[PDB]
Coordinates of N, CA and C in Angstrom, one line a residue:
Chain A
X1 N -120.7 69.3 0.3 CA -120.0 68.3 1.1 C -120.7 66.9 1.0
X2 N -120.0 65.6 0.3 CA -121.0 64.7 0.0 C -120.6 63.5 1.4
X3 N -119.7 64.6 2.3 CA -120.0 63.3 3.5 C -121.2 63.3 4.1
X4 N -122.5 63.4 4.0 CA -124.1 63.8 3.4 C -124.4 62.1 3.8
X5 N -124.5 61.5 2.7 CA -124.9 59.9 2.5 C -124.1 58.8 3.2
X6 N -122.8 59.6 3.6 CA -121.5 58.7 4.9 C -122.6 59.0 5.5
X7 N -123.0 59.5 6.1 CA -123.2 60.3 7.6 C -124.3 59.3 7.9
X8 N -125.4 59.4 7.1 CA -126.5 59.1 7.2 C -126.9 57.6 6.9
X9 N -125.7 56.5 6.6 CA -125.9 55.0 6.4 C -124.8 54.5 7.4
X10 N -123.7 55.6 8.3 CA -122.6 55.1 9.2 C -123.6 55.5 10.6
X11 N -124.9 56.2 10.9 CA -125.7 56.1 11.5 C -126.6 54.7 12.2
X12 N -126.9 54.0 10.7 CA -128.1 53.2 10.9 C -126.9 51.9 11.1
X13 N -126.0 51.5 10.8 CA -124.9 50.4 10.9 C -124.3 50.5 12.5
X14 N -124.8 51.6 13.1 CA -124.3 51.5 14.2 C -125.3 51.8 15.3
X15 N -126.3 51.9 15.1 CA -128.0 51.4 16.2 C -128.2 50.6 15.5
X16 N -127.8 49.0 15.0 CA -127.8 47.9 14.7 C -126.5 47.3 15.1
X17 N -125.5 47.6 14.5 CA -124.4 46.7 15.4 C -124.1 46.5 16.9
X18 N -124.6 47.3 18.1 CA -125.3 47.4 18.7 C -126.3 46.9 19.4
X19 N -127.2 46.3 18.5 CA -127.8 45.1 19.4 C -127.6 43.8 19.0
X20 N -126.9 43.4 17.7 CA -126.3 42.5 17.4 C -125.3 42.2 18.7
X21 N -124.3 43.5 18.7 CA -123.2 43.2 20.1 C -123.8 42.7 21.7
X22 N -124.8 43.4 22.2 CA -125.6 42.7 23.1 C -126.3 41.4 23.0
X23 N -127.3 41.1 22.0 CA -127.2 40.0 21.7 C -126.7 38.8 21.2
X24 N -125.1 39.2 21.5 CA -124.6 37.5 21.2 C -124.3 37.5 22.6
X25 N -124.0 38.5 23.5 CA -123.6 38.5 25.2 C -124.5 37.9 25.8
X26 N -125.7 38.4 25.5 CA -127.1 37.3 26.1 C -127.5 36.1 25.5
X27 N -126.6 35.7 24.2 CA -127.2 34.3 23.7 C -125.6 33.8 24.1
X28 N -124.4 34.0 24.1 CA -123.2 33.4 25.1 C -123.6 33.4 26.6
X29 N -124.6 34.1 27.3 CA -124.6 33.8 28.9 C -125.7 32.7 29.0
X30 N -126.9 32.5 27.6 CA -127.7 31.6 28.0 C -127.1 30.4 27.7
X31 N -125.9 30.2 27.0 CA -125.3 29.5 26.5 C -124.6 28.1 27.4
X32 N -124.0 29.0 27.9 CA -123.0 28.3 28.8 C -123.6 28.0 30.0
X33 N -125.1 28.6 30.5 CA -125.9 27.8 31.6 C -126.0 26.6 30.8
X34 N -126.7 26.2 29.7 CA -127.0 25.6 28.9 C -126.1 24.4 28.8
X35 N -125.3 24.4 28.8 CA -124.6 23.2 28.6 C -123.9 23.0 30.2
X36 N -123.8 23.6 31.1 CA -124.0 22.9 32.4 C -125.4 21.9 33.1
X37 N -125.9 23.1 32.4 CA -127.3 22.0 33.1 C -127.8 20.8 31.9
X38 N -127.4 21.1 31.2 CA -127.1 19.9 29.9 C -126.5 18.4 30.6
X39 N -124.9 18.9 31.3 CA -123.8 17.8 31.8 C -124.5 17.3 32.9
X40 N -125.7 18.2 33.4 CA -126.6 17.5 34.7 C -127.3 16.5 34.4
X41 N -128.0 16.9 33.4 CA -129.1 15.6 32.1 C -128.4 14.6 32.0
X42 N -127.0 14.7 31.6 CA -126.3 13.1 31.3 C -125.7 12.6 32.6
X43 N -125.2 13.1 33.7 CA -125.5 12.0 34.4 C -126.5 11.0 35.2
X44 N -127.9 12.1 35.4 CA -129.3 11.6 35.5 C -129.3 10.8 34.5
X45 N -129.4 10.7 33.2 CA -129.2 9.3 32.1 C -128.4 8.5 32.4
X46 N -127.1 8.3 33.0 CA -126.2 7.3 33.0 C -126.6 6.8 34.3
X47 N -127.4 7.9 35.5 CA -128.1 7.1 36.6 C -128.9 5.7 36.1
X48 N -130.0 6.6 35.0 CA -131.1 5.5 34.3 C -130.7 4.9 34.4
X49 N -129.5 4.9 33.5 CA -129.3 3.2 32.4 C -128.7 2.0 33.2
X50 N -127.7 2.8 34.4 CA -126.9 2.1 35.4 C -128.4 1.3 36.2
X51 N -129.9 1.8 36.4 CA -130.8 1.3 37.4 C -132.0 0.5 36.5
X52 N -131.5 0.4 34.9 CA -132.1 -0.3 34.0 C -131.2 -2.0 34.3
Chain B
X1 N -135.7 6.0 39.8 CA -135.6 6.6 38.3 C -137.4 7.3 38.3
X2 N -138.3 7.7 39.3 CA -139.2 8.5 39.0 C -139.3 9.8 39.6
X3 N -137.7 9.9 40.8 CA -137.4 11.5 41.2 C -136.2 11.9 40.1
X4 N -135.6 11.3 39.3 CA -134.5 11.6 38.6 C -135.7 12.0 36.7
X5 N -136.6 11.0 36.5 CA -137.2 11.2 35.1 C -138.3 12.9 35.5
X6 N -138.7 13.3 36.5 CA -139.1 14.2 37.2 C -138.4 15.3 37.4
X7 N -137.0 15.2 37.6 CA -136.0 16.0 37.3 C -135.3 16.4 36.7
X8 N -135.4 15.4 35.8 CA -135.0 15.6 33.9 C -136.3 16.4 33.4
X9 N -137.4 16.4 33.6 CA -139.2 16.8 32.8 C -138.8 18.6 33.6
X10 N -138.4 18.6 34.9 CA -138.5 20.1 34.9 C -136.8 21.0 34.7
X11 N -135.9 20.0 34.7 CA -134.4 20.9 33.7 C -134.7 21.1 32.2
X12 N -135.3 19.7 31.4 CA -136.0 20.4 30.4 C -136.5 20.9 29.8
X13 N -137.4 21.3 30.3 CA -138.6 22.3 30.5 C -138.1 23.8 30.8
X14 N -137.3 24.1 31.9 CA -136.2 25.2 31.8 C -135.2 25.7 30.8
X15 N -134.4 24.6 30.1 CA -133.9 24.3 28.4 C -134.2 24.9 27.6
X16 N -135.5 24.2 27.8 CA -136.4 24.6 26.3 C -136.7 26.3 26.5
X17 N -137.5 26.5 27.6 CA -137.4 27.7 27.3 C -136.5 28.8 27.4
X18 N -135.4 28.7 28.1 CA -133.5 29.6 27.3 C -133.5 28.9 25.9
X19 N -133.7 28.0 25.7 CA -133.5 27.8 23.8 C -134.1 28.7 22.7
X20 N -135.3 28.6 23.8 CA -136.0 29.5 23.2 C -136.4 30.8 23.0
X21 N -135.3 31.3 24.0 CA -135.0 33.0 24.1 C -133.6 32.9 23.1
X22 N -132.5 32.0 23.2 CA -131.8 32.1 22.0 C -132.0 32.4 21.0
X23 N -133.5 31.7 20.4 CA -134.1 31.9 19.1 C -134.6 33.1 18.8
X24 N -135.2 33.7 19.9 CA -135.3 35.0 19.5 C -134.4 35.9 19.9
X25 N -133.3 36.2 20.3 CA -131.9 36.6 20.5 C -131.3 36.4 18.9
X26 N -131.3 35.1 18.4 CA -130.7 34.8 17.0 C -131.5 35.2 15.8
X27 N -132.9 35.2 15.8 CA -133.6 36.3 14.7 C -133.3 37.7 15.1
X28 N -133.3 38.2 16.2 CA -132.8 39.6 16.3 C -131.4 40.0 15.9
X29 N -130.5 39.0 15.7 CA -129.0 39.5 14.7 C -129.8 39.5 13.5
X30 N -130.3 38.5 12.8 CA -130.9 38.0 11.9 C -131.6 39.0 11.2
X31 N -132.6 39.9 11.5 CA -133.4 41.1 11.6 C -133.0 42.6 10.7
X32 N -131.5 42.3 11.9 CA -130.6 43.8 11.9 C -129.4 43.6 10.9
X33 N -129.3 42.5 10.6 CA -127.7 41.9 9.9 C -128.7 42.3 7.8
X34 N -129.7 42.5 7.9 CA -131.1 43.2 7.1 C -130.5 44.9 6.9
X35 N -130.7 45.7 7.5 CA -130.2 46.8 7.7 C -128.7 47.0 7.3
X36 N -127.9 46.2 7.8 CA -126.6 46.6 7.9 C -126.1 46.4 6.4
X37 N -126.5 45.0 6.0 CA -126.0 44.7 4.2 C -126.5 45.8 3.1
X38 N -128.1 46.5 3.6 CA -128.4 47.0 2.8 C -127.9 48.2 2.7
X39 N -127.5 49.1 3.9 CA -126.7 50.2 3.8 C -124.9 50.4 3.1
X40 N -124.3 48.8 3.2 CA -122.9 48.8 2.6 C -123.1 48.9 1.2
X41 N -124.4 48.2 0.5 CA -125.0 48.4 -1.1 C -124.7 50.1 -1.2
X42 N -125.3 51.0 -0.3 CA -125.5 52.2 -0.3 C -123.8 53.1 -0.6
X43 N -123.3 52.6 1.0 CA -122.0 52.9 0.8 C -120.8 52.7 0.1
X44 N -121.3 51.8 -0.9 CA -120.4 51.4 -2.6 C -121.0 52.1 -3.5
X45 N -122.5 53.0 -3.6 CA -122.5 53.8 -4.9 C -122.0 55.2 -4.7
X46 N -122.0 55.8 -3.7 CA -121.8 57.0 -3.7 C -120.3 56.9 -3.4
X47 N -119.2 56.0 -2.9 CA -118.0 56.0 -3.8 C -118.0 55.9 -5.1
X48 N -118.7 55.3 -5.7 CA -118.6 55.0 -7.3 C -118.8 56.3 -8.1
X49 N -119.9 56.9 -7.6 CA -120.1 58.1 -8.0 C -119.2 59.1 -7.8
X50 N -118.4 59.1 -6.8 CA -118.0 60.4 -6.3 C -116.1 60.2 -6.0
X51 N -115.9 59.2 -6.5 CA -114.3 58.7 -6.2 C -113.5 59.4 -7.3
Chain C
X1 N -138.9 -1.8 27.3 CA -138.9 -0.9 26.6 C -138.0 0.7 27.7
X2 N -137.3 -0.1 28.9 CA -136.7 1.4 29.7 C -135.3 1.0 29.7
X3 N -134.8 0.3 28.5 CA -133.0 -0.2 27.9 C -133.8 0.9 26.7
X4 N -134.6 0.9 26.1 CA -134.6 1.8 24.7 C -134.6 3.0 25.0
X5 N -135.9 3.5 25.9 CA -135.9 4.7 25.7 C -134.9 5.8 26.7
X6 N -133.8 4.3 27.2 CA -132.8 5.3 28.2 C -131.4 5.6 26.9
X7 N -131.5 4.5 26.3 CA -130.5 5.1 24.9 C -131.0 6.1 24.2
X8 N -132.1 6.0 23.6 CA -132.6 6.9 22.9 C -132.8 8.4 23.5
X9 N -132.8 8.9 24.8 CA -132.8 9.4 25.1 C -131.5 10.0 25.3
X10 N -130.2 9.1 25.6 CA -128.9 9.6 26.0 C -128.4 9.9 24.3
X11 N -128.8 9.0 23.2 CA -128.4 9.2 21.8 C -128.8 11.2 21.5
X12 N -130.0 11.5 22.0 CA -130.4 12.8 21.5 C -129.9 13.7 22.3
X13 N -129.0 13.6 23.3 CA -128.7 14.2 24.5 C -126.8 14.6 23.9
X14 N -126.4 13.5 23.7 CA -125.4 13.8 22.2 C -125.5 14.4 21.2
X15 N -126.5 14.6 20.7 CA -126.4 15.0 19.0 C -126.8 17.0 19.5
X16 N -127.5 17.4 20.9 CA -127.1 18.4 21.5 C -126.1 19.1 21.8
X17 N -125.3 18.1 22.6 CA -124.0 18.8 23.1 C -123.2 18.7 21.7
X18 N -123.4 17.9 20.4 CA -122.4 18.3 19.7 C -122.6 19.8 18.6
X19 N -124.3 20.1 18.3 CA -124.6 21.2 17.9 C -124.2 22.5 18.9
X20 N -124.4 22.0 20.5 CA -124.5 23.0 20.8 C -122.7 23.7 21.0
X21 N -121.9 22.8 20.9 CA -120.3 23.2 20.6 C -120.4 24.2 19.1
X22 N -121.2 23.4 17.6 CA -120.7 24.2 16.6 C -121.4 25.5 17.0
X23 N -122.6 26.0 17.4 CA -122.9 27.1 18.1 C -122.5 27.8 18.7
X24 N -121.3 27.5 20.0 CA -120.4 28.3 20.4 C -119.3 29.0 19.8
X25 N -118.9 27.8 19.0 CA -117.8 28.2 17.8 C -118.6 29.1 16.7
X26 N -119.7 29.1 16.5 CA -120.2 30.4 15.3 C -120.7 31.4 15.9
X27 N -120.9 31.2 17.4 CA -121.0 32.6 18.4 C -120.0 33.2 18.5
X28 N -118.9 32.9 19.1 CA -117.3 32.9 18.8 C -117.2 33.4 17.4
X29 N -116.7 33.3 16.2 CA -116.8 33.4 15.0 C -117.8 34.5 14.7
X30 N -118.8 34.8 15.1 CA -119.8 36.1 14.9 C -119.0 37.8 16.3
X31 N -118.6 37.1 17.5 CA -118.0 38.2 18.4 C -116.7 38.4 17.9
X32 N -116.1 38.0 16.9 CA -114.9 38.6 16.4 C -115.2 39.2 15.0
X33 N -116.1 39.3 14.1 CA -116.5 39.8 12.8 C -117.6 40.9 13.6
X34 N -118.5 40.7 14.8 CA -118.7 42.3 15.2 C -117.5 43.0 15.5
X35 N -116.4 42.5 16.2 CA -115.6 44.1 16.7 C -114.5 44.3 15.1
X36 N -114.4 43.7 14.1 CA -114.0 44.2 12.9 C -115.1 44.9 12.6
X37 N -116.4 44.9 12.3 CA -117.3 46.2 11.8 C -117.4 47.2 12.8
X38 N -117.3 47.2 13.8 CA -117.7 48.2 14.9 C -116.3 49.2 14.8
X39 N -114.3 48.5 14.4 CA -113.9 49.4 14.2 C -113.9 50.1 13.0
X40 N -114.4 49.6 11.7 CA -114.7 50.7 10.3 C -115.7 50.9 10.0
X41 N -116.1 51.2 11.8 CA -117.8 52.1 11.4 C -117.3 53.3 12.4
X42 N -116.6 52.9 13.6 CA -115.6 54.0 14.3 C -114.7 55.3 13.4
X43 N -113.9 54.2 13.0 CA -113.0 54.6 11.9 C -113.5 55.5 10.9
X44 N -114.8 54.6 9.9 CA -115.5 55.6 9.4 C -115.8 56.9 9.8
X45 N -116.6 56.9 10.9 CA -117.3 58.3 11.8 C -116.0 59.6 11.7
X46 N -114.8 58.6 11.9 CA -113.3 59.9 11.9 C -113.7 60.2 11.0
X47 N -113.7 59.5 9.5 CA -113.5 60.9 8.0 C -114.7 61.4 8.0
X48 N -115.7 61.8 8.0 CA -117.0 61.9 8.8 C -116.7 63.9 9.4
X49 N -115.8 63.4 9.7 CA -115.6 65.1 10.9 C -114.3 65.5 10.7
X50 N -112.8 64.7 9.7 CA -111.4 64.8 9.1 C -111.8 66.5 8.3
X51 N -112.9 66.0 6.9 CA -113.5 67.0 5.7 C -113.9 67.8 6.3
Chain D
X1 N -111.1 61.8 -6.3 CA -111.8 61.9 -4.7 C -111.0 61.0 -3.8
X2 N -110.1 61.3 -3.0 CA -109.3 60.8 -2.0 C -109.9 60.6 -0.7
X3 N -110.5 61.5 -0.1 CA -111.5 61.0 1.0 C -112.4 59.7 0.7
X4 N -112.9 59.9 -0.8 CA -113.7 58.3 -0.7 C -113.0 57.2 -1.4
X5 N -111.8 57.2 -1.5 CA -110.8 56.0 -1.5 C -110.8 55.7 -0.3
X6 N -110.4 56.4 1.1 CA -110.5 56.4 2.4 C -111.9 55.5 2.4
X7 N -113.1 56.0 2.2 CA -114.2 55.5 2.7 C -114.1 53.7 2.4
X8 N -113.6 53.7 1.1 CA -113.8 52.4 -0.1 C -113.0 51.6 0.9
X9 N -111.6 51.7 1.8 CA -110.7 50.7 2.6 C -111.5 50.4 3.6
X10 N -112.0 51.4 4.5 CA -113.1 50.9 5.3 C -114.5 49.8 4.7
X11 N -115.2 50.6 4.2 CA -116.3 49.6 3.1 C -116.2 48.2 2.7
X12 N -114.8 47.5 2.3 CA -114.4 46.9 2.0 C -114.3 45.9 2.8
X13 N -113.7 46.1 4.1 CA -113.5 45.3 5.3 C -115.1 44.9 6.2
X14 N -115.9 45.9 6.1 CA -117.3 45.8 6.6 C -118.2 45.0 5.6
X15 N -117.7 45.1 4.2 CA -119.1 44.1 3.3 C -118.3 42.6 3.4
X16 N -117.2 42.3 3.4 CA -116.7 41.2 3.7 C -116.8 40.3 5.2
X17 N -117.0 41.2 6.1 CA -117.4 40.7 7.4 C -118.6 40.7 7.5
X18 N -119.8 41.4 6.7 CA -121.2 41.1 7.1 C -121.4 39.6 6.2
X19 N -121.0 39.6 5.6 CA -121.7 38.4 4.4 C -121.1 37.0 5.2
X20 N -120.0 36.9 5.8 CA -119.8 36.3 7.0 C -120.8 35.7 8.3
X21 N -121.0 37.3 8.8 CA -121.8 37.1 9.8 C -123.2 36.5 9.2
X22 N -123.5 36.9 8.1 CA -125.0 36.3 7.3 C -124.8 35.2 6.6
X23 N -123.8 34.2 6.6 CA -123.8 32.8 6.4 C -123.6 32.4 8.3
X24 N -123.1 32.9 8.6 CA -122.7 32.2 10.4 C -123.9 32.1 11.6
X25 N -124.9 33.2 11.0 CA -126.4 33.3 11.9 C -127.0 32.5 11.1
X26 N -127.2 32.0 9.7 CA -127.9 30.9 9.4 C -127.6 29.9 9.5
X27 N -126.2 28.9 10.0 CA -125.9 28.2 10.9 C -126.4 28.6 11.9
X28 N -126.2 29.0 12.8 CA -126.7 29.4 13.7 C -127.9 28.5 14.5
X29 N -129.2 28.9 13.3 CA -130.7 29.3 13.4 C -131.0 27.4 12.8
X30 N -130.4 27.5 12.0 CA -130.6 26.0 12.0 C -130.0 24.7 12.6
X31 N -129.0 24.8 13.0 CA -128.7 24.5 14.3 C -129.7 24.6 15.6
X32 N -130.3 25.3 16.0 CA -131.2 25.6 17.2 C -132.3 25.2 16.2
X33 N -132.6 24.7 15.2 CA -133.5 24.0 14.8 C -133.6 22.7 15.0
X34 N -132.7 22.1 15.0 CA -132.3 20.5 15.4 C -132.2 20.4 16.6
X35 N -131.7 21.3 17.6 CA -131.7 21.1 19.3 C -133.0 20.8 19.7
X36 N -133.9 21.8 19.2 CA -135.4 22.1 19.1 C -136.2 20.9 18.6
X37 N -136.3 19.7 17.9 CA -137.0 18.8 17.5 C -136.4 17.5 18.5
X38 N -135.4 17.4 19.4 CA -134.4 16.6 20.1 C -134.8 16.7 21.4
X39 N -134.9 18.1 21.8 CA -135.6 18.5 23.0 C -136.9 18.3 23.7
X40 N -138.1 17.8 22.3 CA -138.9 17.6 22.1 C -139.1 16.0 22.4
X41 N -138.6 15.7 21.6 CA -137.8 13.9 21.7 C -137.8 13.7 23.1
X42 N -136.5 14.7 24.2 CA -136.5 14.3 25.2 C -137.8 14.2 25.8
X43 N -138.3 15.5 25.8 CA -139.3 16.0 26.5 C -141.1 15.2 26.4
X44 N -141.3 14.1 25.1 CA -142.0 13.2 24.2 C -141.3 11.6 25.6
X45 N -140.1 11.6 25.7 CA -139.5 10.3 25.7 C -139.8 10.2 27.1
X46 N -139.1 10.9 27.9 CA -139.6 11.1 29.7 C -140.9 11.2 29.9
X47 N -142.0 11.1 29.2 CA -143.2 11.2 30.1 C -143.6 9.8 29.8
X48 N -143.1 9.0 28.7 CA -143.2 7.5 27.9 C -142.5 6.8 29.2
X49 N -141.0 6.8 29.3 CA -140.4 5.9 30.4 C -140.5 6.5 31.2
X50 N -141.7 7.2 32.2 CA -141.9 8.0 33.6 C -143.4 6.4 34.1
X51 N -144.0 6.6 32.5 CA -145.3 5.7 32.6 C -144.9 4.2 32.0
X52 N -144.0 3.6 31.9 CA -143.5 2.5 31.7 C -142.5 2.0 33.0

């Protein structure tokens, strides 16, 4: 039976896709803090420039 | 502007380091995306062989 | 010199939020090409146990 | 071999979407390379106009 070499490379593609799938969930949740506290920075800047 | 440049030095500072878990979050696809191409190489000869 | 380094600072503060959008969209763009391999690695596993 | 015609439709769809994903994570990475020299900037620039 040569489903042998399936078996054994549809194994290792899937304890790797796997943490690829977790890790875009944790680089989308640091993400999107990220650009809120980002929109915080620009209006502290437009305080600056407004007290320049 | 020296409690606001103060409050920008520590949101920064916070930034940087989530950026810098991104980075390592984004070498770890990086890493494994290593694994995955090399096994599809695998899964195109033994159809070739055996189709 | 605090008219320059309040542009210069809001100039780099831009050139972030616009990388950090094409980054969403290639985050985006990578969570839809995992669940295409995750289903013909599923799919795969069927003929796997079909033989 | 009919089962690995089967395998070859699947195969096909997965080497086409990794080579994807392996141009999209080196955007990616270089992209958070430029955030990362900017951040620095900021981080260089606020301790300049904190002491000015």
């Amino acid at each position: 039976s040569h489903m042998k070499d399936v078996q054994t490379e549809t194994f290792s593609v899937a304890e790797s896709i796997e943490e690829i799938s977790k890790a875009n969930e944790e680089i989308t949740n640091q993400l999107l803090g990220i650009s809120k506290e980002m929109d915080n920075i620009s209006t502290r800047i437009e305080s600056i420039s407004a007290s320049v | 502007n020296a409690k606001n440049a103060e409050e920008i030095t520590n949101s920064v500072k916070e930034v940087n380091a989530r950026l810098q878990e991104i980075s390592a979050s984004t070498e770890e696809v990086t890493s494994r995306v290593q694994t995955i191409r090399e096994n599809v190489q695998m899964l195109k000869e033994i159809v070739a062989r055996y189709k | 010199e605090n008219a320059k380094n309040a542009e210069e600072i809001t100039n780099s503060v831009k050139e972030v939020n616009a990388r950090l959008q094409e980054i969403s969209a290639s985050t985006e763009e990578v969570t839809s090409r995992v669940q295409t391999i995750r289903e013909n690695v599923q799919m795969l596993k069927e003929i796997v146990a079909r033989y | 071999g009919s089962h690995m015609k089967d395998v070859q439709t699947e195969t096909f769809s997965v080497a086409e979407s990794i080579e994807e994903i392996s141009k999209a994570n080196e955007e990616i990475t270089n992209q958070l390379l430029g955030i990362s020299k900017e951040m620095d900037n900021i981080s260089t620039r606020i301790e300049s106009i904190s002491a000015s």
